[PDB]
Amino acid sequence: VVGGTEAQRNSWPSQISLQYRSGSSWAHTCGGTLIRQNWVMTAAHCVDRELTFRVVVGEHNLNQNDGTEQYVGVQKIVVHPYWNTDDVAAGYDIALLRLAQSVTLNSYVQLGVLPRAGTILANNSPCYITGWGLTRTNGQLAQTLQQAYLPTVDYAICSSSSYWGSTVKNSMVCAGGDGVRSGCQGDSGGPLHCLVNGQYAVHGVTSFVSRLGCNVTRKPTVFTRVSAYISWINNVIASN
Ligand SMILES: [Ca+2]
């Protein structure tokens, strides 16, 4: 997250860190949202590589013991069937991970609330992106969980020529674009949390930013629209 501030430890309890095994250690690669005690929602592109993945819930500082972490293996990966790794702009950048154990819920570990199917946010709706992604274009991952205030940019503006054009689909949510604050690499798969009728809900799954840079004016961060996948999500969970 570029232009973020450190999250309070209990603000975003559904945020997870998706990590892969490297050497005798683990490396953060992406975010995720805990949606059942044994299921995480993330970006399809986060799991294209044939790596060994684990999920950390109750995580705050990737580089320090917080006393609140639970570590769990990924047992099964269900990528959206229409996902095409060579075409992120086509959409479908979503995957569900079934965890090897059910995590224990507490003030640091909670299920993310999802919007009802079809819900679209009005332009300029208040949201926060959260993650441990790069804090600058071509930068380094955050140690502590970051948040940034990123208001939505509706489909009509986002898909206009000076923004993202035909690259953005109605199955996505755009947010930010101010040139200061944005998602960045390593935020992929994580939540966009938007305040609606008094409650935060996870309306986006971080998908992409410009090849030019993370915080580029009129290239808001783009997210898979969660409310386009409610039926898909339920179908997967019910069959697995
Ligand atoms: Ca930690």
Side-chain angles (χ1 to χ4, degrees), residues 32-93:
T33 295
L34 190 70
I35 67 168
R36 301 284 186 282
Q37 278 182 81
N38 66 331
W39 287 95
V40 166
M41 177 176 68
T42 194
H45 79 258
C46 288
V47 291
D48 286 324
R49 299 176 290 168
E50 305 284 338
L51 305 166
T52 297
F53 293 102
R54 77 178 181 178
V55 163
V56 194
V57 302
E59 179 59 299
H60 182 67
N61 186 324
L62 289 176
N63 299 82
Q64 283 170 211
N65 178 32
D66 294 284
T68 55
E69 304 93 327
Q70 299 171 52
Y71 300 94
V72 62
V74 170
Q75 184 181 69
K76 184 181 181 90
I77 297 171
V78 186
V79 174
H80 196 285
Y82 263 6
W83 169 245
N84 179 356
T85 193
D86 291 317
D87 194 353
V88 68
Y92 304 110
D93 193 8

Coordinates of all heavy atoms in Angstrom, one line a residue, residues 32-93:
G32 N -5.5 -11.7 1.4 CA -6.7 -12.6 1.3 C -7.7 -12.1 2.4 O -7.3 -11.3 3.2
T33 N -8.9 -12.6 2.3 CA -10.0 -12.3 3.2 C -10.5 -13.6 3.7 O -10.9 -14.5 2.9 CB -11.1 -11.5 2.5 OG1 -10.6 -10.2 2.0 CG2 -12.3 -11.3 3.4
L34 N -10.5 -13.8 5.0 CA -11.1 -14.9 5.7 C -12.6 -14.8 5.5 O -13.2 -13.9 6.0 CB -10.7 -14.9 7.2 CG -11.1 -16.3 7.9 CD1 -10.2 -17.4 7.4 CD2 -11.0 -16.1 9.4
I35 N -13.2 -15.8 4.9 CA -14.7 -15.8 4.7 C -15.5 -16.9 5.4 O -16.7 -16.8 5.6 CB -15.1 -15.6 3.2 CG1 -14.7 -16.9 2.4 CG2 -14.4 -14.4 2.6 CD1 -15.4 -16.8 1.0
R36 N -14.8 -18.0 5.7 CA -15.3 -19.0 6.6 C -14.1 -19.4 7.5 O -13.0 -19.0 7.2 CB -15.8 -20.2 5.8 CG -16.9 -20.0 4.8 CD -18.3 -19.8 5.5 NE -19.4 -19.8 4.5 CZ -19.7 -18.7 3.8 NH1 -19.0 -17.6 3.8 NH2 -20.7 -18.8 2.9
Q37 N -14.4 -20.1 8.5 CA -13.3 -20.5 9.4 C -12.3 -21.4 8.7 O -11.1 -21.4 9.0 CB -13.8 -21.2 10.7 CG -14.3 -20.2 11.8 CD -14.8 -20.9 13.0 OE1 -14.0 -21.3 13.9 NE2 -16.1 -21.1 13.1
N38 N -12.7 -22.0 7.6 CA -11.7 -22.8 6.8 C -11.7 -22.4 5.3 O -11.3 -23.2 4.5 CB -12.1 -24.3 6.9 CG -13.4 -24.6 6.3 OD1 -14.3 -23.8 6.2 ND2 -13.6 -25.8 5.8
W39 N -12.1 -21.2 5.0 CA -12.0 -20.7 3.6 C -11.5 -19.3 3.5 O -12.0 -18.4 4.3 CB -13.3 -20.8 2.9 CG -13.8 -22.1 2.5 CD1 -14.7 -22.8 3.2 CD2 -13.5 -22.8 1.3 NE1 -14.9 -24.0 2.5 CE2 -14.2 -24.0 1.4 CE3 -12.7 -22.5 0.2 CZ2 -14.1 -25.0 0.3 CZ3 -12.6 -23.5 -0.8 CH2 -13.3 -24.7 -0.7
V40 N -10.5 -19.0 2.6 CA -10.0 -17.7 2.3 C -10.3 -17.4 0.8 O -10.2 -18.2 -0.1 CB -8.5 -17.6 2.5 CG1 -7.9 -16.4 1.9 CG2 -8.1 -17.6 4.0
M41 N -10.7 -16.1 0.6 CA -10.9 -15.5 -0.7 C -9.7 -14.7 -1.0 O -9.3 -13.8 -0.3 CB -12.1 -14.6 -0.7 CG -12.4 -13.9 -2.0 SD -14.0 -12.9 -1.9 CE -13.5 -11.6 -0.7
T42 N -9.2 -14.9 -2.2 CA -8.0 -14.2 -2.7 C -8.1 -14.1 -4.2 O -9.2 -14.3 -4.8 CB -6.7 -15.0 -2.3 OG1 -5.5 -14.1 -2.5 CG2 -6.5 -16.3 -2.9
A43 N -7.0 -13.6 -4.8 CA -6.9 -13.3 -6.3 C -6.4 -14.6 -6.9 O -5.5 -15.3 -6.4 CB -6.0 -12.2 -6.6
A44 N -7.0 -15.0 -8.0 CA -6.5 -16.1 -8.8 C -5.1 -16.0 -9.2 O -4.3 -17.0 -9.1 CB -7.3 -16.3 -10.1
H45 N -4.6 -14.7 -9.5 CA -3.3 -14.6 -10.0 C -2.2 -14.9 -8.9 O -1.2 -15.3 -9.2 CB -3.0 -13.2 -10.7 CG -2.8 -12.1 -9.8 ND1 -3.8 -11.1 -9.5 CD2 -1.6 -11.7 -9.1 CE1 -3.2 -10.2 -8.6 NE2 -2.0 -10.5 -8.4
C46 N -2.6 -14.8 -7.7 CA -1.8 -15.0 -6.5 C -1.4 -16.5 -6.4 O -0.4 -16.9 -5.9 CB -2.5 -14.6 -5.2 SG -2.6 -12.9 -5.0
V47 N -2.2 -17.4 -7.0 CA -1.9 -18.8 -6.9 C -1.7 -19.4 -8.3 O -1.7 -20.7 -8.4 CB -3.0 -19.5 -6.1 CG1 -2.9 -19.0 -4.6 CG2 -4.4 -19.2 -6.7
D48 N -1.3 -18.7 -9.3 CA -0.8 -19.3 -10.6 C 0.4 -20.1 -10.4 O 0.6 -21.1 -11.0 CB -0.6 -18.2 -11.7 CG -1.8 -17.5 -12.2 OD1 -2.8 -18.2 -12.3 OD2 -1.8 -16.3 -12.7
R49 N 1.3 -19.6 -9.5 CA 2.6 -20.4 -9.4 C 2.4 -21.7 -8.6 O 1.5 -21.7 -7.6 CB 3.6 -19.5 -8.8 CG 3.9 -18.2 -9.7 CD 4.9 -17.2 -9.0 NE 4.4 -16.6 -7.8 CZ 5.1 -15.9 -7.0 NH1 6.5 -15.7 -7.1 NH2 4.5 -15.3 -5.9
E50 N 3.1 -22.7 -8.9 CA 3.0 -24.0 -8.3 C 3.8 -24.0 -7.0 O 4.7 -24.9 -6.8 CB 3.5 -25.1 -9.3 CG 2.9 -25.1 -10.7 CD 1.5 -25.7 -10.9 OE1 1.1 -26.5 -10.0 OE2 0.8 -25.5 -11.9
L51 N 3.4 -23.2 -6.0 CA 4.2 -23.1 -4.8 C 3.5 -23.8 -3.6 O 2.3 -24.1 -3.7 CB 4.4 -21.6 -4.5 CG 5.0 -20.7 -5.5 CD1 4.8 -19.2 -5.2 CD2 6.5 -21.1 -5.8
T52 N 4.2 -23.9 -2.5 CA 3.6 -24.3 -1.3 C 3.1 -23.1 -0.5 O 3.8 -22.2 -0.2 CB 4.6 -25.1 -0.4 OG1 5.0 -26.3 -1.1 CG2 4.0 -25.5 0.9
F53 N 1.8 -23.1 -0.3 CA 1.2 -21.8 0.3 C 0.7 -22.1 1.8 O 0.3 -23.3 2.1 CB 0.0 -21.4 -0.5 CG 0.3 -20.9 -1.8 CD1 0.1 -21.7 -2.9 CD2 0.8 -19.6 -2.0 CE1 0.4 -21.2 -4.2 CE2 1.1 -19.1 -3.3 CZ 0.9 -19.9 -4.4
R54 N 0.8 -21.1 2.6 CA 0.1 -21.1 3.9 C -0.6 -19.8 4.1 O -0.3 -18.8 3.4 CB 1.1 -21.4 5.1 CG 1.9 -20.2 5.5 CD 2.8 -20.5 6.7 NE 3.6 -19.3 7.0 CZ 4.4 -19.2 8.1 NH1 4.6 -20.3 8.9 NH2 5.1 -18.1 8.3
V55 N -1.5 -19.8 5.0 CA -2.2 -18.6 5.4 C -1.9 -18.3 6.8 O -1.9 -19.2 7.7 CB -3.7 -18.9 5.2 CG1 -4.6 -17.9 6.0 CG2 -4.1 -19.0 3.7
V56 N -1.7 -17.0 7.1 CA -1.6 -16.5 8.5 C -2.8 -15.6 8.7 O -3.0 -14.6 8.0 CB -0.2 -15.8 8.7 CG1 0.0 -15.6 10.2 CG2 1.0 -16.6 8.1
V57 N -3.5 -15.9 9.8 CA -4.5 -15.1 10.3 C -4.1 -14.4 11.6 O -3.1 -14.9 12.3 CB -5.9 -15.8 10.5 CG1 -6.3 -16.5 9.2 CG2 -5.8 -16.9 11.7
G58 N -4.7 -13.3 12.0 CA -4.3 -12.7 13.2 C -2.9 -12.1 13.1 O -2.2 -12.0 14.1
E59 N -2.5 -11.8 11.9 CA -1.2 -11.2 11.6 C -1.3 -9.7 11.6 O -2.3 -9.1 11.1 CB -0.6 -11.8 10.3 CG 0.8 -11.3 9.9 CD 1.9 -11.5 11.0 OE1 1.7 -11.0 12.1 OE2 2.9 -12.3 10.8
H60 N -0.2 -9.0 12.1 CA -0.1 -7.6 12.1 C 1.3 -7.1 11.6 O 1.4 -6.3 10.7 CB -0.4 -6.9 13.4 CG -0.3 -5.4 13.4 ND1 -1.2 -4.6 12.7 CD2 0.6 -4.5 13.9 CE1 -0.9 -3.4 12.8 NE2 0.2 -3.3 13.5
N61 N 2.4 -7.7 12.2 CA 3.7 -7.3 11.8 C 4.4 -8.6 11.2 O 4.5 -9.6 11.9 CB 4.5 -6.7 12.9 CG 5.9 -6.2 12.6 OD1 6.6 -6.8 11.7 ND2 6.3 -5.2 13.3
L62 N 4.7 -8.5 9.9 CA 5.3 -9.7 9.2 C 6.7 -10.1 9.8 O 7.2 -11.2 9.6 CB 5.4 -9.4 7.7 CG 4.1 -9.4 7.0 CD1 4.4 -9.0 5.5 CD2 3.4 -10.7 7.0
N63 N 7.3 -9.1 10.4 CA 8.7 -9.2 10.9 C 8.8 -9.3 12.4 O 10.0 -9.4 12.9 CB 9.5 -8.0 10.4 CG 9.5 -8.0 8.8 OD1 8.6 -7.5 8.2 ND2 10.6 -8.6 8.2
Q64 N 7.7 -9.5 13.2 CA 7.7 -9.6 14.6 C 6.6 -10.5 15.2 O 5.6 -10.6 14.6 CB 7.5 -8.2 15.3 CG 8.7 -7.3 15.3 CD 8.4 -5.9 15.7 OE1 9.1 -4.9 15.3 NE2 7.5 -5.7 16.6
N65 N 6.9 -11.1 16.3 CA 5.9 -12.0 16.9 C 4.8 -11.1 17.5 O 5.1 -10.3 18.4 CB 6.4 -12.8 18.0 CG 5.4 -13.6 18.7 OD1 4.4 -14.1 18.2 ND2 5.6 -13.9 20.0
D66 N 3.6 -11.2 17.0 CA 2.4 -10.3 17.6 C 1.7 -11.0 18.7 O 0.9 -10.4 19.5 CB 1.5 -10.0 16.5 CG 2.1 -9.1 15.4 OD1 2.2 -7.9 15.7 OD2 2.4 -9.5 14.3
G67 N 1.9 -12.3 18.9 CA 1.2 -13.1 19.9 C -0.2 -13.5 19.6 O -0.9 -14.0 20.4
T68 N -0.6 -13.3 18.3 CA -2.0 -13.4 17.9 C -2.1 -14.2 16.6 O -3.3 -14.6 16.2 CB -2.6 -12.0 17.6 OG1 -1.8 -11.3 16.7 CG2 -2.7 -11.2 18.9
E69 N -1.0 -14.6 16.0 CA -1.0 -15.3 14.7 C -1.5 -16.8 14.8 O -1.2 -17.4 15.8 CB 0.5 -15.3 14.1 CG 1.1 -14.0 13.9 CD 2.0 -13.5 15.0 OE1 1.7 -13.8 16.2 OE2 2.9 -12.7 14.7
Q70 N -2.2 -17.3 13.9 CA -2.4 -18.7 13.7 C -2.0 -19.0 12.2 O -2.3 -18.3 11.3 CB -3.9 -19.0 13.8 CG -4.5 -18.7 15.1 CD -6.1 -18.9 15.1 OE1 -6.6 -19.9 14.7 NE2 -6.8 -17.8 15.6
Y71 N -1.3 -20.1 12.1 CA -0.7 -20.5 10.8 C -1.4 -21.8 10.3 O -1.5 -22.7 11.1 CB 0.8 -20.8 11.0 CG 1.6 -19.7 11.6 CD1 1.8 -19.5 13.0 CD2 2.1 -18.7 10.8 CE1 2.5 -18.4 13.5 CE2 2.8 -17.6 11.3 CZ 3.0 -17.5 12.7 OH 3.7 -16.4 13.1
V72 N -1.8 -21.8 9.1 CA -2.5 -22.9 8.5 C -2.2 -23.2 7.1 O -2.2 -22.3 6.3 CB -4.1 -22.8 8.8 CG1 -4.6 -21.6 8.1 CG2 -4.8 -24.0 8.4
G73 N -2.1 -24.5 6.8 CA -1.8 -24.9 5.4 C -3.0 -24.7 4.5 O -4.1 -24.7 5.0
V74 N -2.7 -24.5 3.2 CA -3.8 -24.5 2.2 C -3.9 -25.9 1.7 O -3.0 -26.5 1.1 CB -3.4 -23.5 1.1 CG1 -4.3 -23.7 -0.2 CG2 -3.4 -22.1 1.6
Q75 N -5.2 -26.5 1.8 CA -5.5 -27.8 1.5 C -6.0 -28.0 0.1 O -5.8 -29.0 -0.5 CB -6.5 -28.4 2.5 CG -6.8 -29.8 2.3 CD -7.9 -30.2 3.3 OE1 -9.0 -29.8 3.2 NE2 -7.5 -31.0 4.3
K76 N -6.7 -27.0 -0.4 CA -7.3 -27.1 -1.7 C -7.4 -25.7 -2.3 O -7.8 -24.7 -1.6 CB -8.6 -27.8 -1.7 CG -9.3 -28.0 -3.0 CD -10.7 -28.7 -2.9 CE -11.3 -28.9 -4.3 NZ -10.9 -30.1 -5.0
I77 N -7.2 -25.5 -3.6 CA -7.2 -24.3 -4.3 C -8.2 -24.4 -5.4 O -8.1 -25.2 -6.3 CB -5.8 -23.8 -4.9 CG1 -4.8 -23.6 -3.8 CG2 -6.0 -22.5 -5.7 CD1 -3.4 -23.4 -4.3
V78 N -9.2 -23.5 -5.4 CA -10.3 -23.5 -6.4 C -10.3 -22.1 -7.0 O -10.7 -21.1 -6.5 CB -11.7 -23.7 -5.8 CG1 -12.7 -23.8 -7.0 CG2 -11.8 -25.0 -4.9
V79 N -9.7 -22.1 -8.3 CA -9.6 -20.9 -9.0 C -10.9 -20.7 -9.9 O -11.5 -21.8 -10.3 CB -8.3 -20.9 -9.9 CG1 -8.2 -19.7 -10.8 CG2 -7.1 -20.8 -9.0
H80 N -11.3 -19.5 -10.1 CA -12.5 -19.3 -11.0 C -12.2 -20.0 -12.3 O -11.1 -19.7 -12.9 CB -12.8 -17.9 -11.2 CG -14.2 -17.8 -11.8 ND1 -14.4 -18.0 -13.1 CD2 -15.4 -17.5 -11.2 CE1 -15.7 -17.9 -13.4 NE2 -16.3 -17.6 -12.2
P81 N -13.1 -20.8 -12.8 CA -12.8 -21.6 -14.1 C -12.6 -20.7 -15.3 O -12.1 -21.2 -16.3 CB -14.1 -22.4 -14.3 CG -15.0 -22.1 -13.2 CD -14.3 -21.3 -12.2
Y82 N -13.0 -19.5 -15.3 CA -12.8 -18.6 -16.5 C -11.6 -17.8 -16.4 O -11.3 -17.0 -17.3 CB -14.1 -17.8 -16.7 CG -15.1 -18.3 -17.8 CD1 -15.0 -19.5 -18.4 CD2 -16.2 -17.5 -18.1 CE1 -15.9 -20.0 -19.3 CE2 -17.1 -18.0 -19.1 CZ -17.0 -19.2 -19.6 OH -17.9 -19.6 -20.5
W83 N -10.8 -17.9 -15.3 CA -9.6 -17.2 -15.1 C -8.6 -17.6 -16.2 O -8.4 -18.7 -16.5 CB -9.0 -17.5 -13.7 CG -7.5 -17.0 -13.6 CD1 -6.4 -17.7 -13.4 CD2 -7.1 -15.6 -13.6 NE1 -5.3 -16.9 -13.3 CE2 -5.7 -15.6 -13.4 CE3 -7.8 -14.4 -13.7 CZ2 -5.0 -14.5 -13.4 CZ3 -7.0 -13.2 -13.7 CH2 -5.6 -13.3 -13.5
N84 N -7.9 -16.6 -16.7 CA -6.9 -16.7 -17.7 C -5.7 -15.9 -17.3 O -5.8 -14.6 -17.4 CB -7.4 -16.3 -19.1 CG -6.3 -16.5 -20.2 OD1 -5.1 -16.8 -19.9 ND2 -6.7 -16.3 -21.4
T85 N -4.6 -16.5 -16.9 CA -3.4 -15.8 -16.4 C -2.8 -14.8 -17.4 O -2.2 -13.8 -17.0 CB -2.3 -16.8 -16.0 OG1 -1.3 -16.0 -15.2 CG2 -1.7 -17.5 -17.1
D86 N -2.9 -15.0 -18.7 CA -2.4 -14.1 -19.7 C -3.4 -12.9 -20.0 O -3.1 -12.2 -21.0 CB -2.1 -14.8 -20.9 CG -0.9 -15.8 -20.8 OD1 0.2 -15.4 -20.1 OD2 -1.1 -16.8 -21.3
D87 N -4.5 -12.8 -19.2 CA -5.5 -11.9 -19.5 C -6.2 -11.4 -18.2 O -7.4 -11.6 -18.0 CB -6.5 -12.5 -20.5 CG -7.4 -11.4 -21.2 OD1 -7.5 -10.3 -20.8 OD2 -8.2 -11.9 -22.1
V88 N -5.5 -10.7 -17.4 CA -6.0 -10.2 -16.1 C -7.2 -9.2 -16.4 O -8.1 -9.2 -15.6 CB -5.0 -9.6 -15.2 CG1 -4.4 -8.2 -15.7 CG2 -5.6 -9.3 -13.8
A89 N -7.1 -8.5 -17.5 CA -8.1 -7.5 -17.9 C -9.5 -8.2 -18.2 O -10.5 -7.5 -18.2 CB -7.6 -6.7 -19.1
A90 N -9.5 -9.4 -18.5 CA -10.7 -10.2 -18.8 C -11.5 -10.4 -17.5 O -12.7 -10.6 -17.5 CB -10.5 -11.5 -19.4
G91 N -10.9 -10.2 -16.3 CA -11.5 -10.4 -15.0 C -11.4 -11.8 -14.5 O -10.4 -12.6 -14.9
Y92 N -12.3 -12.2 -13.6 CA -12.3 -13.6 -13.0 C -11.1 -13.8 -12.1 O -10.8 -14.9 -11.9 CB -12.4 -14.6 -14.1 CG -13.5 -14.5 -15.0 CD1 -13.3 -14.1 -16.3 CD2 -14.8 -14.7 -14.6 CE1 -14.4 -13.9 -17.2 CE2 -15.9 -14.5 -15.5 CZ -15.6 -14.1 -16.8 OH -16.7 -14.0 -17.6
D93 N -10.5 -12.7 -11.6 CA -9.3 -12.8 -10.8 C -9.7 -13.0 -9.4 O -9.7 -12.1 -8.5 CB -8.5 -11.5 -11.0 CG -7.1 -11.7 -10.4 OD1 -6.8 -12.9 -10.0 OD2 -6.3 -10.7 -10.3

